[PDB]
């Protein structure tokens, strides 16, 4: 195909899955410390409203 | 059978039709557009007992969920959308494989 | 019997108030305004179970 | 009057040990849990350097 | 016995619901609509093994 040096598609794909792996891992390590799985509206917008009312 | 359990019965009997109850017993019959083109005709004593209803066209754009009735409708619409999207994904997939065997063939 | 009637009509207000205060976050469980509410407990649509609180 | 006002001067000022001890015990779990999270969080930069020696 | 009957008819709806809910991705395992299905478990064709769920 292209045994080149300017583009590393395999490295880019590993880059993307590394980003998605530690984005969810960064989402964790804070539900454990806070003790809540709902601490920002981005986790569950519907859950935040009902949880606050409760 | 009460009104809600009847909806579950219809879903189990066939995958061609998705049924649900909105707020008072009204059935929200659904019809996937990509495979069940054309209007659906209702018959039988139960159909006369209930309302036949008109054929209303709904897509994801008009998909709204503010009451439980639209919520049961919405999952039906999304399921049809997902099937259409996945099927078209397979079309690209077969296009890719036809081309992978094309590349190594042309090299031969 | 007048004293007992005072206690009876006092507890009567409790029966009415408890039917008006049981809320669960802005709802009304025992008011009778809680109509037939269907709980979607199925993976797909339609597979729900209705519950009525008189 | 003194008996009843002393009862009034409780659950207003005087704490019950029931919910206060459970709150204290619970707070210890969060303190221990978060402190252990620092242990797995300090090593996140370590893994960053691991890719290139 | 009336109260027990309300319990029996409650669980009776559960038996019917679970028969019509167990799906495995759009199928219907326990509804009886699942007829004899043959699973190809060999290299060549035809030597499948039939399975029926009543």
UniProtKB/Swiss-Prot annotation, chain D:
This is Flagellin C. Belongs to the bacterial flagellin family. The chain holds residues 325 to 377 of 377 of the full protein. Flagellin is the subunit protein which polymerizes to form the filaments of bacterial flagella. FlaC is not essential for flagellar synthesis and motility. Heteromer of multiple flagellin subunits including FlaA, FlaB, FlaC, FlaD and FlaE. It comes from Vibrio cholerae serotype O1 (strain ATCC 39315 / El Tor Inaba N16961). The gene is flaC. V.cholerae is able to differentially regulate the flagellins within the flagellum maybe to produce flagella which are particularly suited for motility within a given environment. It comes from the Bacteria. It is found in: Secreted; Bacterial flagellum.
């Amino acid at each position: 195909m292209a045994v080149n040096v300017n583009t590393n598609v395999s490295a880019m794909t590993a880059q993307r899955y590394l980003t998605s792996a530690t984005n969810a891992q960064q989402s964790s390590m804070e539900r454990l410390s806070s003790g809540y799985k709902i601490n920002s509206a981005k986790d569950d917008a519907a859950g935040l409203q009902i949880s606050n009312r409760l | 059978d009460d009104i809600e359990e009847l909806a579950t019965y219809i879903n189990g009997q066939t995958d061609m039709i998705k049924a649900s109850v909105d707020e008072e017993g009204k059935l929200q019959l659904f019809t996937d557009n990509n495979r069940i083109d054309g209007a659906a005709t209702f018959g039988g004593a139960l159909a006369g007992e209930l309302g036949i209803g008109a054929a209303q066209d709904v897509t994801v754009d008009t998909l709204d969920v503010t009451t439980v009735g639209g919520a049961q409708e919405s999952v039906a619409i999304v399921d049809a959308a997902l099937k259409y999207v996945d099927s078209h994904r397979a079309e690209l997939g077969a296009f890719q494989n036809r081309f992978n065997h094309a590349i190594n063939n042309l090299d031969n | 019997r007048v004293a007992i009637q005072e206690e009876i009509t006092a507890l009567n207000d409790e029966l009415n108030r408890v039917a008006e205060t049981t809320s669960f976050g802005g709802n009304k469980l025992l008011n009778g305004t809680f109509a037939t509410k269907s709980f979607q407990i199925g993976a797909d649509n339609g597979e729900a179970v209705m519950l009525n609180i008189k | 009057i003194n008996e009843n006002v002393n009862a009034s001067k409780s659950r207003i000022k005087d704490t019950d040990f029931a919910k206060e001890t459970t709150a204290l015990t619970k707070a210890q779990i969060l303190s221990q849990a978060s402190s252990s999270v620092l242990a797995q969080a300090k090593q996140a930069p370590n893994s960053a350097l691991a890719l290139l020696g």
